[PDB]
Write a protein that binds this ligand. Structure first.
Ligand SMILES: *[C@@H]1O[C@H](CO)[C@@H](O[C@@H]2O[C@H](CO)[C@@H](O)[C@H](O)[C@H]2NC(C)=O)[C@H](O)[C@H]1NC(C)=O
Ligand SMILES: CC(C)CCC[C@@H](C)[C@H]1CC[C@H]2[C@@H]3CC=C4C[C@@H](O)CC[C@]4(C)[C@H]3CC[C@]12C
Ligand SMILES: *[C@@H]1O[C@H](CO)[C@@H](O)[C@H](O)[C@H]1NC(C)=O
Ligand SMILES: [K+]
Ligand SMILES: [K+]
Ligand SMILES: [K+]
Ligand SMILES: [Mg+2]
Lengths: 268, 992, 39
């Protein structure tokens, strides 16, 4: 033929069949032992998610949400993702004492449901009403963005203490139980309005620590609705929403490390 | 074009002096007119040689920039700029990826260009050396007056004059001469002075006395002649053009390189476009379809391989430089290993090029002297009183002297003023009797008759050094038979005795044997003149026989020859044991050529020519079956009337071939004949008459000390110490580097698979990219470099000089067996070890292997800063990318770890590491430096930006260890099978 | 620890780099030693 005879062509097939078969069987074996060394409830390493990311619902083309108020299908793209998220926070999804629980309607302290063990059933998560998100189809004019803190197993978000000076200096400082979120731009051509649990501009600490998908399915993380009823129009406004805390840090590279990058433009 | 120049020349030495003048419109006495000479100048053109048109270095460099790998790397470099252009227009990408990768790849092409350019070097100044043989000026007779002119202004027809010490300015017809002798070594390779006279003495113009040639010099006397040829039209000017004009051609090693380039280029374009369409079918945007292709290019092309080859060659050439063997062309480092036929000059190559005493006949006994340079033989006789009598004649009846200031150099190597035979005798006595000058001071010469054409003898009368005599001793030497007709007694073991027919017959026997050995034989005799008949003041007349020259006492015979170099016989046998055919090709006479052939082992004992059979059986040569003769001796005059097909039959039908009295073109023809049969041929030589053959040879080797400038220009290799044993070393080195290149190539190729497979699974699996493009270049250009080079220092696995020369048609540098092992077996195991570490990193950070399938869409989505892992955690864009790049880093390090084992297995093709050992210190160096480089690239701060290399946790380093070990075991088991059964299965499938 | 389990999300990449570079250097020196056993 090309290389060899039929007899040789066969033998080279019988070899590579057994050979690659063995190699596949060995590869799988090493994957088995790897998995055997891992927990079902907690990942081996967590230093790469460490400082929590802050992500929002409006799916930004490039950290930007520009549209026209005087146009219907101009914002119907951002309403798709906005709906996708809030559709999960339905009351019909949170039914019965299992696996949900009614928690303080005001920001409270942490809740420990034991260890990362299966020695108990599904760890009961705090309910969250999308109805706590006042004012927010969504904002056809002047968007109503929804913030979110990335989930990390066993992470206890710790707010800053009012020992020294603060950006939003001491205003509504629920020091003990709220992780604040203050959006900014100089360039003050807007109108910041925050909505959340208990009416505070933060995340209620009663939703922590997260026990993971395996130990807490259907779990709901707290949301923080932000509305920009800015009196300006037809210009790119670089708005940055920043979260503050002891376990919260940022990076010049990762522009989502505990903060937002939104470029709103109501070009109408 | 040069087929005309490969033919024997035609001349006009047969014409009379007068007749020759009519042909050139010339005067025998007055010479040309100033006006007629200038007319002929403009007509024929200058008496000069024009160098052939060369290829500029520009085109030579750029021709390498387009050879398979460079072509693919160019397509990659441009395709980078393509994707970059498409980006800069569509979505403003502030990145530098495609732009920088395009710059990097273009640089890789340029630098790789320098390496191949360095390897494909051609240092040739043939025509320049020939031009150096034309004198600046010549002496001509114009308008009846002699004047010096620019030799280029010399034309056919003018009257030229030459004298001892000057170069022949052009081909001349001798019309007048006085004691003129010439050095025709340019045409023959033999430096013995040849007389020139107006008389025609041979039909063959290269042998007649009435022609003098350009490229030669007058050694003594004076001559006048008419110019018959000028410039390019001279006999050796044509040889110049032939030699300088010959197409170089591709080396065996070069052909091998291009061959695997085709193979690897083939699989590259195959998988390249095979997966380019496979991606579009899967619905991949052309934006991405090209990005994957660039990666495929980088994965398939072994970026550092061609440069490795060059370095391995260079390092092999450095070792040979250290044995006095200079390599002018890097590729010639290997040709000697692939050589199946050596065509060797005799004089100054196989031989020392110096008349040396070989045997002596005295006391009715043949004695042999030591002919070797360094005198590696033994003594023959010292005791016999006869010896001292013969020794005295050899010293006394000798007019040769050592040049001043030689006392530092060895006797046999020092320059001597005199003819070759007298120098030989001088050096013979000086060696075994001490200072000859002393013997010539103790015995003052009073009268002598120098060797005469008519007398055929030379005699001398000396004052006997003996005090009790202080009388007159007569000594003489000459033609053995002439000396015999002048002897009455023979000095036997001390005492004289009558010359009976018995001893006279033993003389003839001794004389015939020595002459049969191709040796020049001389007779020696002396006579103690009677005291009473010769007073202490008796005057001797040299002009008229004033003393007896008959009834003298015969002392002995001495024989001499230009002997082989000490190492030559043994080197010839070694070449022949390695299955290399050795042919002699010489300008010298057949009797001498044949005798040295037997001396060095070109013609082995018992082997006969058709002429030998005929003489032994006493029958006509036509009655001899030529197939009964494995040896042959072909004279150039017969070679001339043979067609190439008939030359091919001679080459095919004889194992032991001697081509004697060959011209320079004839040497070229014999070389081409050998090549025509498909053989790789080496030429060894030292003369300008070897230049065409040396050029045409696959590898020409010139002698460094004895070699002429031309020969060393025409060669690929120079033996700086004239050590012929270096050929044996060269062939051995050549074979070793050929095997080691295979090892180094397999090693380099093996790591291509773990660079290809990640890109494929990236498409077919939709998982995060396991390894990056930059990461690949860190391997092929970084870590693999020193290890790959180090394989060039591997010792032989067996006695390589015991095997036959490779068949260049069947035995390739890269074959299917190499690809099967490197790509199908070992590289495949490396790929898995890479993937394993990849799955380990991701799974330990929260992304278990199961959830990875079909996630790249969301993984690469820059706007999703919340991807969910297996444990329900959310990752931003840059966070997961850090883990991904950490995966690139550990996959990279996995390659390094699996290359550890590969380096050790590529060490040997057959033998076990437990047999070959670990005595390669460069290889071990490679292991340490490779690992140091990898660690540095991972842990050095800032490398995460420039190369996207991230620090690895200690446990990460050990992921591929079980795969590294399986490689070592697998290959060790496999080679154990090879050795345990030379049959073929494992052998014919995987044996590189 | 409980709410004070910050060490769980921390890794000393600084020490690892220092050690990694020490090792790389020493492997580089060791290599020179073995190579220079004859040049
Ligand atoms: C989650 O809540 C949303 C609230 O808008 C539900 O949307 C409803 O969709 C139905 C049918 O398309 C409409 O008739 C209603 O007007 C919507 N709102 C309400 C309050 O009922 C959505 O269907 C819910 N999703 C799930 C899975 O239950
Ligand atoms: C990533 C995976 C799926 C690709 C696997 C590719 C396999 C099938 C390839 C890789 C190397 C290949 C072999 C390389 C060498 C030879 C020897 C030659 O004389 C005949 C073909 C043969 C035997 C090839 C057959 C196919 C082969 C085994
Ligand atoms: C939000 O909606 C409420 C009614 O639910 C209305 O009273 C109020 O004006 C709205 N706020 C703004 C800022 O438009
Ligand atoms: K490669
Ligand atoms: K050559
Ligand atoms: K490679
Ligand atoms: Mg010679």
């Amino acid at each position: 033929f090309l290389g060899r005879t039929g007899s040789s062509w066969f033998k080279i097939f019988l070899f590579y069949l057994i050979f690659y078969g063995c190699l596949a069987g060995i590869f799988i074996g090493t994957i088995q032992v790897l998995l055997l060394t891992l927990s079902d409830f907690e990942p081996k390493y967590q230093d790469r998610v460490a400082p929590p990311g802050l992500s929002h619902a409006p799916y930004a083309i490039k950290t930007e949400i520009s549209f026209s108020i005087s146009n219907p299908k101009s914002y119907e793209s951002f309403v798709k993702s906005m709906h996708k998220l809030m559709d999960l926070y339905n009351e019909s999804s949170q039914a019965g004492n299992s696996p949900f629980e009614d928690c303080s309607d005001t920001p409270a302290d942490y809740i420990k449901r034991g260890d990362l063990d299966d020695s108990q059933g599904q760890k009961k998560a705090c309910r969250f009403s999308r109805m706590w998100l006042k004012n927010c189809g969504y904002a056809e004019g002047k968007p109503c963005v929804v913030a979110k803190l990335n989930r990390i197993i066993g992470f206890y978000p710790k707010p800053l203490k009012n020992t020294t000076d603060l950006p939003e200096e001491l205003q509504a400082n629920y020091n003990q139980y709220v992780l604040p979120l203050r959006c900014a731009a100089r360039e003050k051509i807007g109108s910041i309005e925050y909505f959340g649990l208990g009416g505070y501009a933060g995340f209620p600490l009663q939703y922590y620590p997260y026990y993971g998908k395996r130990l807490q399915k259907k779990y709901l993380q707290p949301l923080l609705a932000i509305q920009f009823t800015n009196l300006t129009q037809n210009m790119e406004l670089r708005i940055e929403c920043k979260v503050y805390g002891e376990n919260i840090d940022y990076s010049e590279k990762d522009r989502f490390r505990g903060r937002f990058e939104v470029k709103i433009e109501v070009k109408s | 074009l040069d087929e005309l120049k490969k033919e024997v020349s035609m001349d006009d030495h047969k014409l009379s002096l007068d007749e020759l003048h009519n042909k050139y419109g010339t005067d025998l006495t007055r010479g040309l007119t100033n006006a007629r000479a200038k007319e002929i100048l403009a007509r024929d053109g200058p008496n000069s040689l024009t160098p052939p048109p060369t290829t500029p270095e520009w085109i030579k460099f750029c021709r390498q920039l387009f050879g398979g790998f460079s072509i693919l790397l160019w397509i990659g470099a441009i395709l980078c700029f393509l994707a970059y252009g498409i980006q800069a227009a569509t979505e403003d990408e502030p990145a530098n990826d495609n732009l920088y990768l395009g710059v990097v790849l273009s640089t890789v092409v340029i630098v790789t260009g320098c390496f191949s350019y360095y390897q494909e070097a051609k240092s040739s100044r043939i025509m320049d050396s020939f031009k150096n043989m034309v004198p600046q000026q010549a002496l001509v007779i114009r308008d009846g007056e002699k004047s010096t002119i620019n030799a280029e202004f010399v034309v056919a027809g003018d009257l030229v004059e030459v004298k001892g010490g000057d170069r022949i300015p052009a081909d001349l017809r001798i019309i007048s001469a006085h004691g003129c002798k010439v050095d025709n070594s340019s045409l023959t390779g033999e430096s013995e002075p040849q007389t020139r006279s107006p008389e025609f003495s041979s039909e063959n113009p290269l042998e007649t006395r009435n022609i003098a040639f350009f490229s030669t010099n007058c050694v003594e006397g004076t001559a006048r002649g008419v110019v018959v040829y000028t410039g390019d039209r001279t006999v050796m000017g044509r040889i110049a053009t032939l030699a300088s004009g010959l197409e170089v051609g591709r080396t065996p090693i070069a052909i091998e390189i291009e061959h695997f380039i085709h193979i690897i280029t083939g699989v590259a374009v195959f998988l390249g476009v095979s997966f380019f369409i496979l991606s579009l079918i899967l619905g991949y945007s052309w934006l991405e379809a090209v990005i994957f292709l660039i990666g495929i290019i980088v994965a398939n092309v072994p970026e550092g391989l061609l440069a490795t080859v060059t370095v391995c060659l260079t390092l092999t050439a450095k070792r040979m430089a250290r044995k006095n063997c200079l390599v002018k062309n890097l590729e010639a480092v290997e040709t000697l290993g692939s050589t199946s036929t050596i065509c060797s000059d005799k004089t100054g190559t196989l031989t020392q090029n110096r008349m040396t005493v070989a045997h002596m006949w005295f006391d009715n006994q043949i004695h042999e002297a030591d002919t070797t340079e360094n005198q590696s033989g033994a003594a023959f006789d010292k005791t016999s009183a006869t010896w001292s009598a013969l020794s005295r004649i050899a010293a006394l009846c000798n007019r040769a002297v050592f040049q001043a200031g030689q006392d530092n150099v060895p006797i046999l190597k020092r320059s001597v003023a005199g003819d070759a035979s007298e120098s030989a005798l001088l050096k013979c006595i000086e060696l075994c009797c001490g200072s000859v000058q002393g013997m010539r001071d103790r015995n003052p010469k009073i009268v002598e008759i120098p060797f005469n054409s008519t007398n055929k003898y030379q005699l001398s009368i000396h004052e006997n050094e003996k005090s009790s005599e202080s009388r007159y001793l007569l000594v003489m030497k000459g033609a053995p038979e002439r000396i015999l007709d002048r002897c009455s007694t023979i000095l036997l073991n001390g005492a004289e005795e009558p010359l009976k027919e018995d001893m006279k017959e033993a003389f003839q026997n001794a004389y015939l044997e020595l002459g049969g050995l191709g040796e020049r034989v001389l007779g020696f005799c002396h006579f103690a003149l009677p005291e009473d008949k010769y007073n202490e003041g008796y005057p001797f007349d040299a002009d008229e026989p004033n003393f007896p020259t008959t009834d003298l006492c015969f002392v002995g015979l001495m024989a001499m020859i230009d002997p082989p170099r000490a190492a030559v016989p043994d080197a010839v046998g070694k070449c022949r044991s390695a299955g290399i055919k050795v042919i002699m090709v010489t300008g010298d006479h057949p009797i001498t050529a044949k005798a040295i052939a037997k001396g060095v082992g070109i013609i082995s004992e018992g082997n006969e020519t058709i002429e030998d059979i005929a003489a032994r059986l006493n029958i006509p040569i036509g009655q001899v079956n030529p197939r009964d003769a494995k040896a042959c001796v072909v004279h150039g005059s017969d070679l001339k009337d043979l067609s190439t097909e008939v030359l091919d039959d001679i080459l095919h039908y004889h194992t032991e071939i001697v081509f004697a009295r060959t011209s320079p073109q004839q040497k070229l023809i014999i070389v081409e004949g050998c090549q025509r049969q498909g053989a790789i041929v080496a030429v060894t030589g030292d003369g300008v008459n070897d230049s065409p053959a040396l050029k045409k040879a696959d590898i020409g080797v010139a002698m460094g000390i004895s070699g002429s400038d031309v020969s060393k220009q025409a060669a690929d290799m120079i033996l700086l110490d004239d050590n012929f044993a270096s050929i044996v070393t060269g062939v051995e080195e050549g074979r070793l580097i050929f095997d080691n290149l295979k090892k180094s190539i397999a090693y380099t190729l093996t790591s291509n698979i773990p660079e290809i497979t990640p890109f494929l699974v990236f498409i077919i699996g939709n998982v995060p990219l396991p390894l990056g493009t930059v990461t690949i270049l860190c391997i092929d250009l970084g870590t693999d470099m020193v290890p790959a080079i180090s394989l060039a220092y591997e010792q032989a696995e067996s006695d390589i000089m015991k095997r036959q020369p490779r068949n260049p048609k069947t035995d390739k540098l890269v074959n299917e067996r190499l690809i099967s092992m490197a790509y199908g077996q070992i590289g495949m195991i490396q790929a898995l070890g890479g993937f394993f570490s990849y799955f380990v990193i991701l799974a330990e950070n929260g992304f278990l292997p199961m959830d990875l399938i079909g996630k790249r869409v969301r993984w690469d989505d820059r706007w999703i800063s919340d991807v969910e892992d297996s444990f329900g955690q959310q990752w931003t864009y840059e966070q997961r990318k850090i883990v991904e790049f950490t995966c690139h880093t550990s996959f990279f390090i996995s390659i390094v770890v699996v290359q550890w084992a590969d380096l050790i297995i590529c060490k040997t093709r057959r033998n076990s590491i437990f047999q070959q050992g670990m005595k390669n210190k460069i290889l071990i160096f490679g292991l340490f430096e490779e690992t140091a480089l990898a660690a540095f690239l991972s842990y050095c701060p800032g490398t995460d930006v420039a190369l996207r290399m991230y620090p690895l946790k200690p446990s990460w380093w050990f992921c591929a260890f079980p795969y590294s070990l399986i490689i070592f075991l697998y290959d060790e088991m496999r080679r154990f099978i090879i050795r345990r059964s030379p049959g073929g299965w494992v052998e014919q499938e995987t044996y590189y | 620890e409980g709410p004070d389990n910050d060490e769980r999300f921390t890794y000393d990449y600084y020490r690892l780099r220092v050690v990694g570079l020490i090792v790389a250097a020493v492997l580089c020196v060791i290599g020179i030693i073995i190579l220079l056993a004859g040049k």
